[PDB]
């Protein structure tokens, strides 16, 4: 009911569209201030505008940058510090390129590392620094169901996305006694992964995923940490 996150600052990566955007909007509907990160300044400014149009009085700031670059993440978190410090993090990225294991080159592996693994680590680090200063925080990582089952066509995801989940479990353990929780959600595969049975018989809507992210980010979810929660209509089963 009352998520108790009014006035808190949520940092959301890939926040101009997709699950990042949907997450940002739901948080703003619950009274969160926003800081959005994605590659393109113009599309970011535009996302901020939509949010303000759907949610009267929403405060949204933006930082344009590349998730693949630690220096851009640093710049994001400097702006967060100036806004009072990151209270909530929603980590979202695009998926790596499709391809079977034996057809990928060294460059493909290094690139998936910069996109997926290093980003989860460095965003986590900078978010953790600020949340531990306050003694309260919520991180929600958006992962892939390829954590649970590999797909032959999604080798980069099966492999180089796994560190995302190690970060969730490691930071959950590290930060647990300092009032910060660190959790992950696993949406429908085609929402997180580039491909080129679902018991419920449909792919998820962004809003359905965003509601769970909101709840995990809430005052109410204070005893949940290190959880990796499928939000996929039962497809993980």
Using CB under 5 A, list all residues that contact Na ion.
Answer: 14, 67, 87, 93-94, 134, 136
Pick 160 or 233: Cβ nearer Na ion:
160
Distance of closest approach, residue 237 Cβ to Na ion, in angstroms: 28
Distance of closest approach, residue 134 Cβ to Na ion, in angstroms: 4
Which of 91, 84, 28 lies closest to 59, judged by CA? 28
Pick 93 or 188: Cβ nearer Na ion:
93
Pick 141 or 233: Cβ nearer Na ion:
141
- Cβ proximity of 232 and 204 under 8 Å: yes
Distance of closest approach, residue 60 Cβ to Na ion, in angstroms: 18
- Cβ proximity of 166 and 121 under 8 Å: no
Pick 93 or 225: Cβ nearer Na ion:
93
Q: What is the DSSP string of 184-215?
A: EEEE-HHHH------TTSSPPPHHHHHHHHHH
Longest CA pairwise span in the chain (Å): 52
Distance of closest approach, residue 151 Cβ to Na ion, in angstroms: 20
Backbone angles phi, psi at 103, to 5 degrees: -100, 5
The terminus-to-terminus CA distance of the chain in angstroms comes to 29
Distance of closest approach, residue 67 Cβ to Na ion, in angstroms: 5
Query: Residues near 196 by Cβ (< 8 Å), separated by ≥ 6?
Result: 98
Residues paired with residue 168 on neighbouring β-strands, in sequence order: none
Gap between the Cα atoms of 237 and 219, Å rounded? 29
Pick 136 or 151: Cβ nearer Na ion:
136
Pick 94 or 226: Cβ nearer Na ion:
94
Distance of closest approach, residue 58 Cβ to Na ion, in angstroms: 19
């Amino acid at each position: 009911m009352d998520l108790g996150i009014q006035g808190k600052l949520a940092v959301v990566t890939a926040g101009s569209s997709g699950l990042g955007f949907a997450s940002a909007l739901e948080l703003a509907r619950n009274g969160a201030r926003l800081l959005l990160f994605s590659r393109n300044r113009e599309k970011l400014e535009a996302a901020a505008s939509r949010i303000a149009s759907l949610v009267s009085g929403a405060q949204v700031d933006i930082v344009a940058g590349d998730i693949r670059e630690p220096g851009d993440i640093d710049r994001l978190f400097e702006k967060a510090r100036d806004l009072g410090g990151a209270d909530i993090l929603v980590y979202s990225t695009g998926g790596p390129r499709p391809g079977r294991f034996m057809e990928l080159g060294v460059e493909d592996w290094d690139e998936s590392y910069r996109l997926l693994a290093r980003s989860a680590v460095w965003v986590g680090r900078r978010a953790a620094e600020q949340m531990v200063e306050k003694g309260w925080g919520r991180m929600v990582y958006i992962g892939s169901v390829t954590l649970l089952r590999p797909w032959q066509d999604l080798a980069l995801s099966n492999i180089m996305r796994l560190p995302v989940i190690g970060v969730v479990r490691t930071l959950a353990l590290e930060l647990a006694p300092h009032g910060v929780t660190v959790n992950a959600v696993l949406p429908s595969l085609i929402l997180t992964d580039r491909v080129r049975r679902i018991p419920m018989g449909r792919v998820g809507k962004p809003e359905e995923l965003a509601s769970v992210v909101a709840f995990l980010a809430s005052e109410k979810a204070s005893f949940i940490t290190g959880a990796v929660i499928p939000v996929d209509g039962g497809a993980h089963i």
